[PDB]
A paper describes a structure:
The other domain acquired by more evolved Dus2 is the dsRBD. By reanalyzing the sequences of eukaryotic Dus2, we found out that the dsRBD does not seem to be restricted to animals but is also present in Choanoflagellates and in Filasterea, all of which are part of the Filozoa clade. To determine if the dsRBDs of animals at the bottom of the evolutionary tree retain the same double-stranded RNA recognition mechanism compared to the dsRBD of hDus2, we crystallized the dsRBD of Dus2 from A. queenslandica, Monosiga brevicolis, and F. alba. Unfortunately, only A. quenslandica dsRBD led to diffracting crystals that allowed structural resolution. A focus on specifically the dsRBD revealed that the overall structure is conserved among all the models. These regions are all present in all dsRBDs analyzed here. In contrast, only one of these positively charged residues is observed in F. alba (R400) and A. queenslandica (K381).
Dus2 is the eukaryotic enzyme responsible for the synthesis of D20 in tRNAs and is involved in some human cancers and in the detoxification of β-amyloid peptides in Alzheimer’s disease. Overall, the structural analyses of all these structures allow for the definition of a canonical Dus fold, which consists of: (i) a TIM-barrel domain on the N-terminal side carrying the active site with the FMN located in the center of the barrel; (ii) a helical domain (HD) formed by 4 helices in a bundle lying on the C-terminal side; and (iii) a linker, which connects these two domains. In contrast, hDus2 was shown to carry an additional domain after the HD, namely a double-strand binding domain (dsRBD) cooperating with the TIM-barrel for tRNA recognition and binding.
Author numbering: 6 to 100
The structure:
């Protein structure tokens, strides 16, 4: 049951842990493979905020937006966490 923001973005509080994906495909890879098979448009729109220099990414798949509600220490972490939100909400099986 994701949180829904005012503009309709679907969010979950997710931190990306790179240690869980050492030498294996990352969440962005799984999500990209799925959107490629479905021919779905996918884009990441990432921002860094001035107050603490953390990052947040809004991933759009077709006309649906997903993002992590946890601001991340890096651009990569914000994008990977947003991909994990999309994977978990859509229900895409990952290892
Ligand atoms: Cl982080």
């Amino acid at each position: 049951d994701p949180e829904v923001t005012e503009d309709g973005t679907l969010e979950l509080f997710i931190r990306y842990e790179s240690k869980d994906y050492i030498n294996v495909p990352t969440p962005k890879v799984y999500l990209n493979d799925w959107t490629t098979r479905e021919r779905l448009p996918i884009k990441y729109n990432t921002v860094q905020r001035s107050k603490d220099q953390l990052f947040k990414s809004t991933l759009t798949i077709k006309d649906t937006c997903y993002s992590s509600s946890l601001w991340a220490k890096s651009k990569r972490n914000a994008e990977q966490s947003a991909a994990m939100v999309a994977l978990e909400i859509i229900g895409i099986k990952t290892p």
